[PDB]
């Protein structure tokens, strides 16, 4: 119905706003775009489902997220990919792991403060009837 389409449009507006606020944070610049295969050749072989904030924005616009839970699975993916690909004790690896965890904690914190729980429940109940 039109009311269900209104609900998903509001969701999309909310998710774009959250993603924009992550994307403009200097700490998270490394997660804003896909990894360049020329700079990092083995990334594509090691990381089976790459994810980045530009991809997330594309998925919002393609209507791929019908709940905030689905959205947070891709934010979690951005984080777990970074922890998987950069596991070493070296400062570079430790810096990106720290930023990846900050990205994840920041996304969850914005959602905790600004997502109405009854709005998320509505989205879930529409998706389960789809
Ligand atoms: C998403 C992503 C990008 C990336 C770019 C370059 N290098 C990476 N990994 C390196 C592996 C070897 N140890 C050093 C690592 O680079 C740490 C840098 C990454 C850019 C931000 C400052 C620290 C990359 N790994 C990735 O997961």
Question: Whose CA is closest to 49, among 34, 27, 65, 32?
Answer: 34
- Ligand 1 mean position to 100 CA, how many Å? 11
List the domains of the chain with CATH numbers.
Answer: 1-130 (1.20.920.10)
DSSP assigned state of 115: S
Contact 11, 126 (CB under 8 A): no
Exposure class string for 5-20: b at 16+ Cβ within 10 A, else e: eebbeebbebbeebbe
Task: List pocket residues of ligand 1, CB cut-off 6 Å.
Answer: 30, 35, 40, 82, 85-86, 90, 92-93, 95-96
Q: What angle do CA 66, 68, 78 make, to 5 degrees?
A: 110
Distance from C-alpha of 114 to C-alpha of 3, rounded to nearest angstrom: 21
Residues whose CB falls within 8 Å of the CB of residue 20, separated by 6 or more in sequence, listed in order:
none
**Residue 90: CB atoms within 10 Å:** 9
By most ligand atoms within 8 Å of CB, the mutation choice from 32, 96, 100, 104 for ligand 1 is: 96
- In the structure, how many helices (H) and strands (E) does the chain have? 6, 0
Go through the chain and tell me how many residues it has.
Answer: 130
* C-alpha separations of 19 from 12, 47, 58, 111 in Å: 10, 22, 11, 11
- What is the structure's resolution, reported in angstroms to one decimal? 2.0
Contact 34, 51 (CB under 8 A): no
Q: How was this structure determined?
A: X-ray
DSSP letters for 20-81? HHHHTSGGGGGGSSPPPTTTSTTHHHH-SS---HHHHHHHHHTT--SSHHHHHHHHHHHHHH
């Amino acid at each position: 119905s039109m009311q269900e389409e209104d609900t998903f449009r509001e969701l999309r507006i909310f998710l774009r706003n959250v993603t924009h606020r992550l994307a403009i944070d200097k700490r998270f610049r490394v997660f804003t775009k896909p990894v360049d295969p020329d700079e990092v050749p083995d990334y594509v072989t090691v990381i089976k489902q790459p994810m980045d904030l530009s991809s997330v924005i594309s998925k919002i616009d393609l209507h791929k997220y019908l709940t905030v839970k689905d959205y947070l699975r891709d934010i979690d993916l951005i984080c777990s990919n970074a922890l998987e690909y950069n596991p070493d004790r070296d400062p570079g690896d430790r810096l990106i792991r720290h930023r990846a965890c900050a990205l994840r904690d920041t996304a969850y914190a914005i959602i905790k403060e600004e997502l109405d729980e009854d709005f998320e429940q509505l989205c879930e109940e529409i998706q389960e009837s789809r």
